[PDB]
Design a protein around this ligand. Sequence first.
Ligand SMILES: COc1nc2ccc([C@](O)(c3ccc(C(F)(F)F)nc3)c3cncn3C)cc2c(Cl)c1-c1ccc(S(C)(=O)=O)cc1
Length: 225
Amino acid sequence: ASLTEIEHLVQSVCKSYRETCQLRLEDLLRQRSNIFSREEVTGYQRKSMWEMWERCAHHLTEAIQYVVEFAKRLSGFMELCQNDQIVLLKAGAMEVVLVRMCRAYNADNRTVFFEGKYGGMELFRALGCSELISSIFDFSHSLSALHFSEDEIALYTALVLINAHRPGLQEKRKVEQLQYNLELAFHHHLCKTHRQSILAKLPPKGKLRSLCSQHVERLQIFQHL
Ligand SMILES: COc1nc2ccc([C@](O)(c3ccc(C(F)(F)F)nc3)c3cncn3C)cc2c(Cl)c1-c1ccc(S(C)(=O)=O)cc1
């Protein structure tokens, strides 16, 4: 577990992420000027819940595909048994997607980028999931308030996926080794960038599971009526 090896792993994970980040940050930031008009918003609000459901499910599906690309590029992930590979992804894919979403959230006006423009939470009114969506904005907002960086997201989400405590793992010790290495990389880098203070400010991991389990419950309902 050399120092050079540790720095190599950091750069690897950050490369893997930059290659699967789906939307470039500079594009997202540039678009913050572009906001949905009152009419446009009303457009989304008139759609049935099932319309918005199909739209968001496709958005979610395409996102999770990028998280799969990312995981497959994490050192040592592909060398796992196919069982553990599926366990980890089914258990952490949604969570990763949710963390990535803070890149699309603008904390200055509480708006999220969605299909070409930024819009508030009223945008997703049709779903009737105001409770949950408000929770998604709050999570993004707190991460956005920390000025979460691309590399930080890459290393955090790598740790979300590679969880040796996931029920159903067969080669558990094999993942434990992966988890340790990544955690060493994540903390070494926070220090190199003088950002280790965010660790106390980070939302608890349980809340990441609590917000996704609430979220994953709705998906089971919306399919298929
Ligand atoms: C807050 O609500 C949401 N906001 C979203 C914001 C963006 C996107 C996004 O897909 C996107 C953008 C950037 C990134 C990046 F950060 F990775 F780059 N990933 C993904 C997108 C938008 N326009 C183009 N794209 C690609 C999807 C969102 C979704 Cl799906 C929800 C949502 C989730 C669950 C429920 S529900 C059924 O559970 O109630 C309802 C709604």
